[PDB]
Design a protein around this ligand. Structure first.
Ligand SMILES: Fc1ccc(-c2ccn[nH]2)nc1
Ligand SMILES: Fc1ccc(-c2ccn[nH]2)nc1
Ligand SMILES: Fc1ccc(-c2ccn[nH]2)nc1
Lengths: 178, 244
């Protein structure tokens, strides 16, 4: 098995910690959802290739511009996250997160991931967003942002239902191998 | 870690660690508060364990088995003895607070009602000054440590066999040299996330809500000072590159 490193970035509450917890845990957290994620080394076999994929979170480092970049050395793949219930988290992608990752991780593939896809058809979410002249992020808005920032690809998932989660990490492993 | 503490923190939550007949006697709000306090202590126990892997397995093993040039081991593991002293003392205080809270006749059933004062003490005065100075030094030496590791692994056969040997056990899967360094750098930014969530479930006693609010502010002030005190050292960096 070859060792690869994955780092997830995105605004606080984009759901990055939850996504790492759900992927790494053997059984879904039905009793307690952890506040933080330390690290994990996943054994993944994708397209016949075995990889040890080390997983890291940047949660807690969003306000600290000199500590945060210490998470980037030797990263092989970046997951750049936004929440579908937060059009504001998508707006911070191109001019905040993207120039930072391109500077510290040149030539590293970025996969733009729309988290919390289950909230796109949630009535409470649609009502709260409608009060600020907003609506959940549309699939074409996510794809266009991924195209604009030079992302390797665009994917969506739901940590709550697990839908799309395995596919994101298998594709991240293929991106890291390229 | 020692077996007694590993077993006390083996469960995925406080609600699964205590006896079910004890859990049943508490309101949901108390359970939510105790689950987050349990996660703070459990992750602090794991953080001290990461520091012991660095000091005892890697650092001391390199000194006792390898013929590395003087000053090379210090460059790979900057400040590890100081970091171990800070966190082992903090962990001792957290575990003593839990131990005093146990019911007579039990080694698992407890409720911690007064964490705020312990957090204010840790993140104020001389202990906060020591944490600030030590993380400013550690985090400024982080990139240099990773580069020195990569150089030694690629060029030194005995170093490569030593690393492959001591990191072979499954229990070391997440704890190679570079992984330990980033786990330590990331530890300090976990504290506000944990304290904020404990505070969210600590409104029942106003003195506790105020103490956790003061603690959260102290931790953020410490992090701001550490972040402002970092400048990455680079081996062989010239003075001209530094002053420009
Ligand atoms: F283009 C960029 C964007 C961000 C940064 C940066 C973020 C934190 N430290 N440095 N550097 C260059
Ligand atoms: F967890 C520990 C702590 C200290 C030591 C130690 C200090 C000197 N010799 N051995 N070993 C293991
Ligand atoms: F599931 C949760 C709920 C709250 C939090 C939280 C609140 C403040 N910091 N972290 N984290 C995870």
């Amino acid at each position: 098995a070859i060792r690869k490193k994955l780092v997830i970035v995105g605004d606080g509450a984009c759901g990055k910690t939850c996504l790492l917890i759900v992927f790494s845990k053997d059984q879904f957290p039905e009793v307690y959802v952890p506040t933080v994620f330390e690290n994990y080394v996943a054994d993944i076999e994708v397209d016949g290739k075995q990889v040890e994929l080390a997983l890291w979170d940047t949660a807690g480092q969003e306000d600290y511009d000199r500590l945060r970049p210490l998470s980037y050395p030797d990263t092989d793949v970046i997951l750049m996250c936004f929440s579908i219930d937060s059009p504001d988290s998508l707006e911070n992608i191109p001019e905040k997160w993207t120039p930072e990752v391109k500077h510290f991780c040149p030539n590293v593939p970025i996969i733009l991931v729309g988290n919390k896809k289950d909230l796109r058809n949630d009535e409470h979410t649609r009502r709260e967003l409608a009060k600020m002249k907003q609506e959940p992020v549309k699939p074409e808005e996510g794809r266009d942002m991924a195209n604009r920032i030079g992302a390797f690809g665009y994917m969506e998932c739901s940590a709550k239902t697990k839908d799309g989660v395995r596919e994101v990490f298998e594709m991240a492993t293929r991106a890291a191998l390229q | 870690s020692m077996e007694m503490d590993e077993k006390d923190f083996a469960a995925d939550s406080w609600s699964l660690a205590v006896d079910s007949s004890f859990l049943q006697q508490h309101k949901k709000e108390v359970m939510k508060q105790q689950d987050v306090i349990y996660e703070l202590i459990q992750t602090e126990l794991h953080h001290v364990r990461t520091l012991k892997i660095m000091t005892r397995l890697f650092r001391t093993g390199m000194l006792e088995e390898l013929h590395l040039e003087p000053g090379v081991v210090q460059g790979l593991f900057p400040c590890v003895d100081e970091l171990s002293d800070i966190h082992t003392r903090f962990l001792s205080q957290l575990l003593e607070r839990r131990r005093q809270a146990l019911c007579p006749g039990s080694t698992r059933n407890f409720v911690i009602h007064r964490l705020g004062d312990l957090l204010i003490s840790q993140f104020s005065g001389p202990s906060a000054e020591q944490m600030c100075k030590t993380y400013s030094e550690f985090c400024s030496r982080h990139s240099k440590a990773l580069k020195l590791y990569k150089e030694l692994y690629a060029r030194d056969k005995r170093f490569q066999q030593f690393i492959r040997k001591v990191t072979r056990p499954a229990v070391l899967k997440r704890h190679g040299v570079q992984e330990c360094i980033l786990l330590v750098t990331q530890r300090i930014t976990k504290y506000p996330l944990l304290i904020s969530r404990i505070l969210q479930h600590s409104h029942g006693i106003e003195e506790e809500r105020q103490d956790l609010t003061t603690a959260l502010g102290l931790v953020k002030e410490l992090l701001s000072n550490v972040d402002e005190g970092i400048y990455q050292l680079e081996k062989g960096a010239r003075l001209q590159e530094i002053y420009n």
